[PDB]
Structure formats: structure tokens, C-alpha cells
Design a protein around this ligand. Structure first.
Ligand SMILES: *[C@@H]1O[C@H](CO)[C@@H](O)[C@H](O)[C@H]1NC(C)=O
Lengths: 9, 44, 251
């Protein structure tokens, strides 16, 4: 439901 | 797998550097029956 | 574990079983974070309301197990505890706030295909992965339903992290920042949850950045098991990372 991919680390 | 230890191996003990990588799976590039569901949840 | 399935061999090598010598009994779940330290829930060790305050010699941790009941010789390792450490601000009187504890093994355990430590998250990893909608994994030998009722083999289930407001509105219990909740909402179709006997177990997530498994939480508490409108609550491990470090860098 409208989701952002994880990024970085 | 890039990983930076956080604890002092002196007190923490050994094992942190190679943490989270399973001998029967990641180490052999083999995936378990449901981990794909976790990865997909990052997109869906 | 409710509505889960049989884990595969070596699927969760950091899974630890808290066991009571006599009368022999499976007490809780726990996780192996190094060859010396095991992480679990404080209420598994201490809960005065039920006359529970176990000591080092009362318990036994069993590492590398798959089967719940049978002795898995040459596979599982049984270690004595050297010392138990409960979080000072652990609130057993009210909401089980800061429900975490560390147990130092007497002698470090040897790693194998069935015994391997899980990673604890860093600020960066915890910030990006502990988001609503993302799924984590819970494992344990707890009951299969709220009401043998017990599995023959380690169980696993994947559950979605839930928005904080929703977690808060699903219960009358005061939820704190060192807690997060997971589970499917009534209209999402799928079901699943942790249950009696799974407490102390790890809520793990696989990092998409380095392929490692990280323990984001510890099975803490819930109202019943897998009830519509309810969610399982977990101790936010990163939130209590300072206490963990403090304890370890001193023993
Ligand atoms: C647990 O028992 C110990 C050892 O007898 C005692 O000092 C302590 O008060 C008990 N735990 C709590 C917080 O009640």
C-alpha cells in the first residue's frame, strides 16, 4: 500500500 | 557481505564479523522456502 | 507459532531454546548473538506475578535444535548459563516495558551448519528496515493455537511490521518506543502470530544491502494469539542497544 524501497547502509 | 563489527570481540566473544550468514543457505548461495516473501515486502 | 510452517534445517541457526531442567520443560525462545551471549525476553526469566524468578542453575539453553522433543546428538549443543542480566528498567508491574535480558554462557559454543549467531542492527540498518509494511520473520516451538497444541519441529512465519498508530489503537496497554508490533490486519487475508512458548524468540529481517539476517526484535507480549484486530508486540532491539553494549563490555 504505497511503499518505499529501503536504501543505503 | 559488507559488515562492520560493533562490539568488542574481547568481551562479546567471536562470531560477529560473520553474523547473519547461514552455513546451509547464504554461504552456499541457497535460499530458504520463504525468504523471497521478505525481500518482496521491501517492494510490495 | 500460529499459522506458520515447519522450518527447514539450518534455516534459523541462531534459534535458542530456554529449557527447565526439572521438571524438564520448554520455557521460551532466545537467540544466539555470539559464541558467548544469548538474547531473550526478561519476562521469560522474571515475572513475580506468577512466582517466576529463575536463576543461572535453574535453566539450560539448547542451541542448534530442529526437533522440539528429541535429543539431537551431534547436532544440538547444551550449555549452562554463567550469568543472567535483566534490564534495570524492565517494567514487569505494568506493560512489560524494556522486556529484554542477556545470558552469558559458561563456556563459548562452537559454530556449525546448525549453530550460527544472528546480527544485531546498527543505527542505519534499523532506521531503514523497521518500517511499516516490511516483513520480518518469527520462529519458535510455541503453541500452534491460542485455545498436542505444540509442534514436533521448529516453526516459522513471516509477519508485516505495523504502523505505530494502529498498534496503539489495537490495545489499552501503554505502548512505548522500545516496542513495535507486527501482524496482518483483519482485512489483509493472511494470518499468523507468535504464541505461548515463543516468547524470547527473535524477530529477524534479511538485509537487502548485505544479505545478512538481523534481529530487529524479541517476541514480547500479545493479547491471546492471532486474534483479529490484535498484533504481536516486540522489543525494539536497536532502541536498547546501549544497554546491551554496556552489559557486554563489562560482564
Ligand atoms: C529474584 O530473587 C533474588 C534472589 O533471591 C532476589 O534478590 C530478587 O529480589 C528477586 N527478583 C525480583 C526483582 O523480585
Amino acid at each position: 500500500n504505497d511503499k518505499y524501497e529501503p536504501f543505503w547502509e | 557481505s559488507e559488515y562492520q563489527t560493533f562490539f568488542n570481540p574481547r568481551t562479546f566473544g567471536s562470531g560477529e564479523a560473520d553474523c547473519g550468514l547461514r552455513p546451509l543457505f547464504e554461504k552456499k548461495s541457497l535460499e530458504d522456502k520463504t525468504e523471497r516473501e521478505l525481500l518482496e515486502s521491501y517492494i510490495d | 507459532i500460529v499459522e506458520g510452517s515447519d522450518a527447514e534445517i539450518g534455516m534459523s541457526p541462531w534459534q535458542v531454546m530456554l529449557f527447565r531442567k526439572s521438571p524438564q520443560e520448554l520455557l521460551c525462545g532466545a537467540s544466539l548473538i555470539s559464541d558467548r551471549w544469548v538474547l531473550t525476553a526478561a519476562h521469560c526469566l522474571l515475572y513475580p506475578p506468577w512466582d517466576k524468578n529463575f536463576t543461572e542453575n535453574d535453566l539450560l539453553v539448547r542451541i542448534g535444535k530442529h526437533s522440539r522433543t528429541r535429543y539431537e546428538r551431534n547436532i544440538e549443543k547444551i550449555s549452562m548459563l554463567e550469568k543472567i542480566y535483566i534490564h534495570p528498567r524492565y517494567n514487569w508491574r505494568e506493560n512489560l516495558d524494556r522486556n529484554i535480558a542477556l545470558m552469558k554462557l559458561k563456556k563459548p559454543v562452537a559454530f556449525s551448519d546448525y549453530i550460527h549467531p544472528v546480527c544485531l542492527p546498527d543505527r542505519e540498518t534499523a532506521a531503514s528496515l523497521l518500517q511499516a509494511g516490511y516483513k520480518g520473520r518469527v520462529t519458535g516451538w510455541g503453541n500452534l493455537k491460542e485455545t498436542k497444541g505444540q509442534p514436533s519441529v521448529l516453526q516459522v512465519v513471516n509477519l508485516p511490521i505495523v504502523e505505530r498508530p494502529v498498534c496503539k489503537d489495537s490495545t489499552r496497554i501503554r505502548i512505548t518506543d522500545n516496542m513495535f508490533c507486527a501482524g496482518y490486519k483483519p482485512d489483509e487475508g493472511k494470518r499468523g502470530d507468535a504464541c505461548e512458548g515463543d516468547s524470547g524468540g527473535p524477530f529477524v529481517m534479511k538485509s537487502p544491502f548485505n544479505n545478512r539476517w538481523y534481529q530487529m526484535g524479541i517476541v514480547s507480549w500479545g493479547e491471546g494469539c492471532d486474534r483479529d484486530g490484535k498484533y504481536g508486540f516486540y522489543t525494539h532491539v536497536f532502541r536498547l542497544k546501549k544497554w546491551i553494549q554496556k552489559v557486554i563490555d563489562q560482564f
